[PDB]
Design an enzyme around this catalytic site. Structure first.
Site, PDB file in Angstrom:
ATOM      1  N   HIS A   1      35.618  14.787  -1.864  1.00 55.52           N
ATOM      2  CA  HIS A   1      34.948  15.701  -0.087  1.00 55.52           C
ATOM      3  C   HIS A   1      33.761  15.050  -0.407  1.00 55.52           C
ATOM      4  O   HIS A   1      33.017  15.318  -1.973  1.00 55.52           O
ATOM      5  CB  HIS A   1      35.458  17.549  -0.888  1.00 55.52           C
ATOM      6  CG  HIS A   1      36.574  17.350  -0.958  1.00 55.52           C
ATOM      7  ND1 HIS A   1      36.468  18.007   0.636  1.00 55.52           N
ATOM      8  CD2 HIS A   1      37.394  17.739  -1.647  1.00 55.52           C
ATOM      9  CE1 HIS A   1      38.204  18.685   0.771  1.00 55.52           C
ATOM     10  NE2 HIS A   1      38.622  18.319  -0.747  1.00 55.52           N
TER      11      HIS A   1
ATOM     12  N   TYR B   1      41.896  21.791  -8.946  1.00 50.43           N
ATOM     13  CA  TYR B   1      40.131  22.067  -8.937  1.00 50.43           C
ATOM     14  C   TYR B   1      39.648  22.959  -9.888  1.00 50.43           C
ATOM     15  O   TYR B   1      40.921  24.140 -10.378  1.00 50.43           O
ATOM     16  CB  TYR B   1      39.890  22.967  -7.749  1.00 50.43           C
ATOM     17  CG  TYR B   1      40.183  21.528  -6.530  1.00 50.43           C
ATOM     18  CD1 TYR B   1      39.518  20.747  -6.131  1.00 50.43           C
ATOM     19  CD2 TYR B   1      41.519  21.164  -5.766  1.00 50.43           C
ATOM     20  CE1 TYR B   1      39.123  19.679  -5.097  1.00 50.43           C
ATOM     21  CE2 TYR B   1      41.433  20.400  -4.995  1.00 50.43           C
ATOM     22  CZ  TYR B   1      40.038  19.293  -4.200  1.00 50.43           C
ATOM     23  OH  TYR B   1      40.318  19.045  -3.157  1.00 50.43           O
TER      24      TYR B   1
ATOM     25  N   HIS C   1      41.798  12.179  -2.517  1.00 48.60           N
ATOM     26  CA  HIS C   1      41.175  12.772  -2.139  1.00 48.60           C
ATOM     27  C   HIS C   1      39.363  12.667  -2.861  1.00 48.60           C
ATOM     28  O   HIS C   1      39.461  13.905  -4.086  1.00 48.60           O
ATOM     29  CB  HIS C   1      41.211  13.359  -0.199  1.00 48.60           C
ATOM     30  CG  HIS C   1      41.677  14.579  -1.811  1.00 48.60           C
ATOM     31  ND1 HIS C   1      42.878  14.564  -1.704  1.00 48.60           N
ATOM     32  CD2 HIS C   1      40.097  15.569  -0.420  1.00 48.60           C
ATOM     33  CE1 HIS C   1      42.519  16.537  -1.650  1.00 48.60           C
ATOM     34  NE2 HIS C   1      41.467  16.947  -1.013  1.00 48.60           N
TER      35      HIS C   1
ATOM     36  N   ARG D   1      48.823  16.794  -0.319  1.00 47.75           N
ATOM     37  CA  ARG D   1      47.219  16.061  -0.114  1.00 47.75           C
ATOM     38  C   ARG D   1      47.125  14.657  -0.592  1.00 47.75           C
ATOM     39  O   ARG D   1      47.248  14.258  -2.052  1.00 47.75           O
ATOM     40  CB  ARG D   1      45.823  16.639  -0.744  1.00 47.75           C
ATOM     41  CG  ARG D   1      45.328  17.996  -0.146  1.00 47.75           C
ATOM     42  CD  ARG D   1      45.192  17.800   1.546  1.00 47.75           C
ATOM     43  NE  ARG D   1      44.746  16.813   2.596  1.00 47.75           N
ATOM     44  CZ  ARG D   1      43.690  16.411   2.559  1.00 47.75           C
ATOM     45  NH1 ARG D   1      42.383  16.780   1.442  1.00 47.75           N
ATOM     46  NH2 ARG D   1      43.312  15.182   2.575  1.00 47.75           N
TER      47      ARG D   1
ATOM     48  N   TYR E   1      47.510  16.556  -4.391  1.00 47.10           N
ATOM     49  CA  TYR E   1      47.521  18.194  -4.679  1.00 47.10           C
ATOM     50  C   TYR E   1      48.366  18.621  -3.339  1.00 47.10           C
ATOM     51  O   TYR E   1      48.399  18.297  -2.453  1.00 47.10           O
ATOM     52  CB  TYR E   1      45.966  18.473  -4.345  1.00 47.10           C
ATOM     53  CG  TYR E   1      46.057  20.335  -4.427  1.00 47.10           C
ATOM     54  CD1 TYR E   1      45.270  20.873  -5.603  1.00 47.10           C
ATOM     55  CD2 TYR E   1      45.757  20.980  -2.892  1.00 47.10           C
ATOM     56  CE1 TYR E   1      45.447  22.879  -5.537  1.00 47.10           C
ATOM     57  CE2 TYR E   1      45.224  21.879  -3.503  1.00 47.10           C
ATOM     58  CZ  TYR E   1      45.852  22.580  -4.270  1.00 47.10           C
ATOM     59  OH  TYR E   1      45.620  24.214  -4.534  1.00 47.10           O
TER      60      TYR E   1
HETATM   61  O1  LIG Z   1      44.245  23.752   4.037  1.00 50.05           O
HETATM   62  C1  LIG Z   1      43.039  22.644   3.225  1.00 50.05           C
HETATM   63  O2  LIG Z   1      42.369  22.624   4.400  1.00 50.05           O
HETATM   64  C2  LIG Z   1      42.985  21.932   1.723  1.00 50.05           C
HETATM   65  C3  LIG Z   1      43.788  22.936   0.742  1.00 50.05           C
HETATM   66  C4  LIG Z   1      43.745  21.249  -0.201  1.00 50.05           C
HETATM   67  C5  LIG Z   1      42.973  20.099  -0.517  1.00 50.05           C
HETATM   68  O3  LIG Z   1      42.639  19.606  -0.795  1.00 50.05           O
HETATM   69  N1  LIG Z   1      42.514  19.899   0.732  1.00 50.05           N
HETATM   70  O4  LIG Z   1      40.857  19.383   0.633  1.00 50.05           O
HETATM   71  C6  LIG Z   1      41.908  20.520   1.592  1.00 50.05           C
HETATM   72  C1  LIG Z   2      40.395  20.934  -0.891  1.00 51.57           C
HETATM   73  N1  LIG Z   2      38.965  22.192  -1.029  1.00 51.57           N
HETATM   74 FE   LIG Z   3      40.590  19.028  -1.616  1.00 51.40          FE
END
Ligand SMILES: O=C(O)c1ccc(O)[n+]([O-])c1
Ligand SMILES: [C-]#N
Ligand SMILES: [Fe+3]
Ligand SMILES: O=C(O)c1ccc(O)[n+]([O-])c1
Ligand SMILES: O=C(O)c1ccc(O)[n+]([O-])c1
Ligand SMILES: O=C(O)c1ccc(O)[n+]([O-])c1
Ligand SMILES: [C-]#N
Ligand SMILES: [C-]#N
Ligand SMILES: [C-]#N
Ligand SMILES: [Fe+3]
Ligand SMILES: [Fe+3]
Ligand SMILES: [Fe+3]
Lengths: 200, 233, 233, 200, 233, 200, 200
Positions: free
Chosen positions: B159, B105, B157, B154, B144
Site C-alpha cells: 500500500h 498483516y 501488494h 489479493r 492474502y
Molecule cells: O477489502 C479490501 O478492500 C482489502 C482486503 C485485503 C487487502 O489486502 N486489501 O488491500 C484490501
Molecule cells: C489491505 N489493508
Molecule cells: Fe492490503
C-alpha cells in the site's frame, strides 16, 4: 489534442490502512513523530473546538475502518503548510474512526476566512478527504459551521451546489462535549441525506 | 503561509477506478449515488502540507530493521515521483505498508492463519529527494485471502500513500509485482477499467538496482497530477 | 525379480539441456567431451526399484509439519505423472527439496544471509497413487543469489526427483512458478534450448485446487519416457 | 512422422541435492527410513565387497558434491526390485562424495551374470547414474570388475565401445580396505582417461 | 446419509448472467442490491437428493406419447452431463418443459393466440445413465412473443433443470437451436455477457443420431461444477 | 493458470416453470410420482412444523410466479439423500407461490444440528434456492428459527454476515396455524430489509 | 523488467594497436606526453620493483602483439587517479610485449593494502587488463606477490577462486634483475595452467 503522462491510478486504502497511517489504532507501537488528530496546541490563537462525527454507508451502518485527512486555515485564515510537531498550530491532521463506537475526533481551532481565486471570501471551512476499504478513490468534502449562517449563505463554493437541501449536508452542528465547544459532522456516503462530495 | 500560485490538471475519472465496481463487494454500499460537484481550484485545494521538517527515524524507510531479520525475499523498492509534465516532486512524503512474507498483516483485525514474523512490522515512510527519488527496503509480501467471492486472493501488494504539493495531488494506491498471475483475477485491480492504467501499478524487476548476493530490486515510479501556473485568469 | 518386458522411448537429447552450456559456468568442467555410447536396452536398463514398501512417515509430503508453522506463502503442489503415451505412473516415488521463503536452504554449504526458518526443513517425498497423482504442501521458496555471473539469481524453484518404472526413466528436474520474471534470465533454465521445453517446467497457478482462506495451489504434471511392449525382436 | 508427449526436461540436481536425497550429508536429521549406501545385510548371500571411488572434473579436481544411484543384480544375477529395508539385499542404493575427502562408498555383494535381450550374458556389472551441480542431465555408466577378465572380454555391452582403451575406464580395480575386499572405481567426467558414459 | 466428502469448483459469476440486466425488464425489480455473502462449503451445500428410486413412468422422457400425435417437427434432444473435470454425472435428474410447435405453452397464464396442441403436454423428465447420457423425444418448439420491448420474440427454446450431485450443482437453463436468427436479438440470451457462454446453450443438429424417414436429432451437453476431493483441510 | 471446462450458464426459469416443476400449479394433470411440498409423513420423528411466506420484489410487490426448492437434515441432523415417496422423511422438497394470494407452504420437521467443515455446529436451518421469471441465476438463502436464539448467536454461517441487522432477515418468526406450529419466512429480493443471499 | 541503454560492444584491439596506444612500439614518433610503463619516478616512496612476463596462447606460443594496462594503489594503499607525468607516482600505466622476445616490463612500486566493500583488506595486487588481436573483449586479472603469502591466504578476492590450484596462477615469482627486485608474471590465456580471469 495534447496528452500528458497519465496520473497513477488510485486504489482503496484497504481495511488495514491503520498499520501505515494510524499506528496507534492498528494497535502497533508508534514512532517518535506521528501525524495525528491534534492540529492545535493549547496555546494556539483562535477559538479551540472539538470536531467529531460518524461515517455511514448506504445501508445506514457505521463505517468503522474509515481514515480521514483534514486541511484548514488557522484562526487568521492562513494555511500553515510547514508541518512540524513544534508548531502551536498545524493546518494538517489525521484521524480515524474507532472500531467500537465508530467515531472520529479532531482537536483544532475554528478556521478564519479565505478568498477564492476571484477574490470572494469563502465561509470558514475544513477540507476533508475520506479513505477506506470499499472506496476506490478518496472522497472530497467540506465541513462548514452552523453558527456561520451569514457567511455560509454567501459562500461561492456552497452556492455551486444546485439544490439548497444538499448544502445542508455540509454543515456541522454545534454542541458541547465535556462542556467544550464541539461541532458534529456525520458523513453519509450513500443514500438519504448523502453528503455532497466534490471534484476539483 | 502557502499561496494560490498553481492550478492542477483535472483528474481523469475514467482512468482511475470508478466508485461503484460490483465485483468488489464493499464498494456497493460505500459509493455515492449522487454525482460529484465540480468546484474551481482555490487556495484551499491548491496547497497542502510540507513534511520537510518531520522528524524521521534512521530506519523509517528500512522495514528490515525498523521493527532478528525478517524471513522473506529481501527487496529494495525504489522509483521516482514526477507530475504529469514529467517534473520531479522533491521532498514529498511517501508512506507504505504491507503484509509479511506469508500474507499476514500486523493488525488486530487480521485473522489469517499465516503467522506474524517477530522481526517484521510492515510500515515505512520517507521523503523523496531533490530529484524526486525514494527508496525502501523490505521483504516481498505474500498474497492474502479475503472475504469477497468464495476464493478471492489479493495478489502480493504494497500500500502506498503519496502527498505531493497539494491536497489536490494526494494519492493512495497499491503496487503489484511483475508477472503475478493473481493480478488479472483481482476484483480490486479490476476496479480499474483501462488495462493501460493497470500496467501503471505493476513494479518491474530492476536487476540494475539489485545488490548482488544480497537483495533484488523493483522499480515503481508514481505520477501525480500536472502542476501549471495560472494564466489569463 | 523384475523382467525384461518393456522398451522405453529413446530420449531426445535435443529437448533436454545439453551437457556443455557455457553461461552455466560449472558445466564447462563437468561435461564429457567424448560422445555418449549408445547401447540397446536390456534388463539392466529396463527395470528399476519399486518403493511401494518403503516406510513413509505421516507428514513425509507435508513440509508445513514435517520439520510452529513456517512463515511464507502456503501452497499445495500437485499434478500427475504420465509417460509419453499419456499412461499414468502409479506408485512412483516423487521427492522434492527447496529453500525457505527467503531463499535460504537448510544445508551446511549455504551461506546466503537470509535466515533459516526454525519451523522449515525443505524436504518432501511421496508415492503417486493409482492415477499417477501426487501432492505436497509447502511454502513458496524465494529466489537465490549464486556465484555464476556477478548478479545471477535463481528464480524461485523446487527440486524434483522422480523414479518411474525403470532406471531408464529416472529423472531429476526443477519446477518454476508461472510469471516469474527471473525465469527467462537464468542460465540454468537457459541450458534448455527449446522455449517449448522451458514451458514444461513452469507450474501453473491452480485456483480450483486452492483451499479458500487457507492456501493457494500450483499444478505440475511430469512426463516420463514412453513405455512400450517389445515386438518382433 | 508421429510425435508423443515430450518428456519433462532434466535440470541439474544443484549443490544442495543432499537436503533432499542424502539427509545425513546435508547434516540434517534423517527420517525413519532412508535409501542409502548399504545394499546388503551381513547375512546376504554372495561375496561381500566394498566399492569406493572419487569423481574428477575436467581440470583434474575432485567433485565433492556428487550424488550417485546404483542398480545391480544380486549374487544370483537377479534384480531385486521390491525395495525394502527388511530385505537382506536391495538391488538399489544411493551414495554421495564427502565434502572433505570427496570419496563415496557402497557396501554390497558382487553381482551375478545377466543376459542381454539377445540372450547373451553380460559380465558382472553395476549400473551407475551420476548427478551434481554442473551436470544438466545425469550420466550413465557401468562398473565392471578387473578380476572378471574372461567375462569382460566377451561382454556384448563392453564390446560396443569402439576403442579398446576406452573400455578400460569402466573396470574397477580390486584392492583391500581394512582387510576387506574392495574395488576402486574413479570417475573422470572430462579429459584424459574420461570414463565411458552411455545413452540408452 | 449423505457425507461431506466433496468440494465444488467456485462458480464463475462473470460467466453466468448477472442479476441486473435491464434489457430484460423484469430483472430490474427482481435482483438483489446487496452483494451475495460468500460462505465456505459444508455438508449442507455439498449434498443433495438422489432420484434413483423415483418412480418414472414409461413415457416420462417421450413428449410424443406422454400427454393422437402432436403436430410439429419430431426431434430427439440428447446429450451428456459431465462436470468441469469432464467426468460423467450418472443417475442425475434432467427435467425439461417447452411450448408446442406454435409457441404456445400449456399453462393457465399463457394467453398467446396460437392454439394448444391436443396431443402435446410439453413436459419430460429422465435420469442420466451410467455414462451421463440423457435423451428426450419431442417436437421443435416455436418462437413466442412476450411483453418486454414492444416487439420481443423468444427464440425457440427448451427449459432445462439439472440436479447434479448436490444443491451446489443444481442448475436451470435454456437450450436454443443452431442457426436461429432470433438468438442474438433476445434480451434474456443477452443477459449472458460473454458470447462464448452463449454458444454453450446452442444445441447442434445431429444427423448421426437422427432416425431416417422419422425424426431429426439435436445434441446438448451440460457441464456442472467440477467436483474434487478435499485436501489438507 | 489452469482452466477447466466452463459450466453451462444459467437462464431464468421463466413464468411457466410450473408446467415442468409444479404440475398441479400449471393446472395440468400430475404424474404418478411428483416432488412436492411435503417432506414429512405425519408419522415421521421430530417436531412437525408448517412453513409459509411471501416473496417481494424491489417495489414491495408480491412475486406470484416464484418457485422454491428446499434441503434440510432430519430431526437427527442427518441428510436423507435417497429420495423416495415411501420414506416418512425426505430432505428435499419443492414449493411455489399461489398465482392469487402469492404464498408458499411446506410441511416438514424442524432440522437437527449439523457441523460445518471445521466441526463447529450450525444452528438448525433450511437451505432454500429461489427461481423465477426475472431471476437470471437462482438465489440461495437459509431459513433459521426465532426460537433457536442461543444457537443462532453461535452459528458460524450467520456470523459471516458482517452487519447484525442483516442476520435478522434469515430468522423465521414462529406462530401457529390451525393449532399447528408455523414459521413465517418472507423473502425480500430487493430493497428495504433485503434478505441475505449466499454464494458457495 | 527495466532496460537501460545497451553498452557499446567490444571489438578486438587488432594487431596494429601500437600505432594508437604504444607509439614507440609501432616504430612511430611519440608525442610530447605519452602514457607508458613507468609508474614511479625513482624518488617515489615505497619499494621499487620491476615487473615482467610473457603471454602464451593455448598452443603455448608467445603472444607478441599483446597490449596491457595496469592499475594499482601507491605504497600507502591509495589510488592516485589524477594522472600527470609530473607526479612521482601514477596508479595507471601501459605496457606491451616485444615483437621479438615477446616480453613486457613495468617499473613501479609494490602496492599497499586496500580494503574491499565489506572492509576486509585485500592482499597487495595489481589489476591488469589484457588486449590483443584475437581477443574480442579484454581479459581482467590480478597480479599478487609470492612474498605476501600471509596476506594472499586471507584475500577475500583470492578466496572466491574455488580451486586452490587456480589461485597459484595469480602469484608473481620474486627474483632480481640487475640487482633490482623483479617479479615475473606469465599469462597463459588458454590451457594447462590457464590464468584466472575475472568478471566485475
Ligand atoms: O477489502 C479490501 O478492500 C482489502 C482486503 C485485503 C487487502 O489486502 N486489501 O488491500 C484490501
Ligand atoms: C489491505 N489493508
Ligand atoms: Fe492490503
Ligand atoms: O550452481 C548450481 O547449479 C545451483 C545453485 C543454486 C541453486 O539453487 N540451484 O538450483 C543450482
Ligand atoms: O419473462 C420471461 O422471463 C419469459 C417469458 C417467456 C418465456 O418463454 N421465457 O422463457 C421467459
Ligand atoms: O587480425 C585482426 O584481428 C585484425 C586484422 C586487421 C585489422 O585491421 N584489424 O582491425 C584486426
Ligand atoms: C540447488 N541446490
Ligand atoms: C417460459 N416461461
Ligand atoms: C587493425 N589492427
Ligand atoms: Fe536450488
Ligand atoms: Fe419459455
Ligand atoms: Fe584494423
Amino acid at each position: 489534442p495534447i496528452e500528458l503522462l497519465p496520473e497513477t491510478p488510485s486504489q482503496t486504502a484497504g481495511p488495514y490502512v491503520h498499520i501505515g497511517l494510524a499506528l496507534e489504532a492498528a494497535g502497533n507501537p508508534t514512532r517518535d513523530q506521528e501525524i495525528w488528530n491534534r492540529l492545535a496546541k493549547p496555546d494556539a490563537p483562535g477559538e479551540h473546538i472539538l470536531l467529531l462525527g460518524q461515517v455511514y454507508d448506504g445501508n445506514g451502518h457505521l463505517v468503522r475502518d474509515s481514515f480521514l485527512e483534514v486541511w484548514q486555515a488557522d484562526a487568521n485564515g492562513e494555511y500553515q503548510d510547514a508541518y512540524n510537531l513544534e508548531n502551536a498550530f498545524n493546518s494538517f491532521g489525521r484521524t480515524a474512526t474507532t472500531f467500537d463506537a465508530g467515531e472520529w475526533t479532531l482537536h483544532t481551532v475554528k478556521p478564519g476566512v479565505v478568498n477564492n481565486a476571484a477574490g470572494v471570501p469563502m465561509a470558514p471551512h475544513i477540507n476533508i478527504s475520506l479513505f477506506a476499504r470499499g472506496i476506490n478513490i478518496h472522497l472530497h468534502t467540506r465541513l462548514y459551521f452552523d453558527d456561520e449562517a451569514q457567511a455560509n449563505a454567501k459562500c461561492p463554493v456552497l452556492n455551486l451546489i444546485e439544490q439548497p437541501q444538499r448544502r445542508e449536508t455540509l454543515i456541522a452542528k454545534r454542541c458541547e462535549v465535556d462542556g467544550k465547544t464541539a461541532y458534529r459532522f456525520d458523513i453519509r456516503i450513500q443514500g438519504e441525506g448523502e453528503t455532497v462530495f466534490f471534484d476539483f | 503561509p502557502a499561496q494560490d500560485n498553481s492550478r492542477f490538471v483535472i483528474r481523469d475519472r475514467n482512468w482511475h477506478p470508478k466508485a461503484l465496481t460490483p465485483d468488489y463487494k464493499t464498494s456497493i454500499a460505500r459509493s455515492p449515488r449522487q454525482a460529484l460537484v465540480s468546484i474551481p481550484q482555490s487556495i484551499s485545494e491548491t496547497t497542502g502540507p510540507n513534511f520537510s521538517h518531520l522528524g524521521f527515524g534512521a530506519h523509517d524507510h528500512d522495514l528490515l530493521l525498523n521493527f532478528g531479520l525478517p524471513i522473506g525475499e529481501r527487496i529494495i523498492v525504489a522509483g521516482r515521483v514526477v507530475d504529469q509534465y514529467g517534473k520531479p516532486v522533491p521532498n514529498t512524503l511517501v508512506e507504505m505498508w504491507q503484509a509479511n512474507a506469508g500474507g499476514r498483516y500486523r493488525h488486530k483485525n487480521d485473522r489469517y492463519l499465516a503467522p506474524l514474523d517477530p522481526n517484521f512490522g510492515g510500515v515505512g515512510r520517507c521523503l523523496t529527494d531533490s530529484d524526486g527519488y525514494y527508496s525502501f527496503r523490505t521483504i516481498k509480501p505474500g498474497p492474502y485471502p479475503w472475504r469477497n467471492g468464495p476464493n478471492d486472493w489479493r495478489p502480493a501488494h504494497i500500500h502506498f500513500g503519496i502527498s505531493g504539493p497539494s491536497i489536490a495531488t494526494k494519492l493512495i494506491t497499491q503496487l503489484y509485482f511483475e508477472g503475478d498471475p493473481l493480478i488479472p483475477m483481482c476484483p480490486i485491480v479490476k476496479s480499474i477499467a483501462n488495462p493501460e492504467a493497470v500496467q501503471q501499478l505493476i513494479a518491474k524487476l530492476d536487476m540494475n538496482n539489485a545488490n548482488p548476493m544480497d537483495c533484488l530490486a523493483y522499480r515503481f515510479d508514481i505520477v501525480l497530477r500536472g502542476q501549471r501556473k495560472t494564466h489569463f485568469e
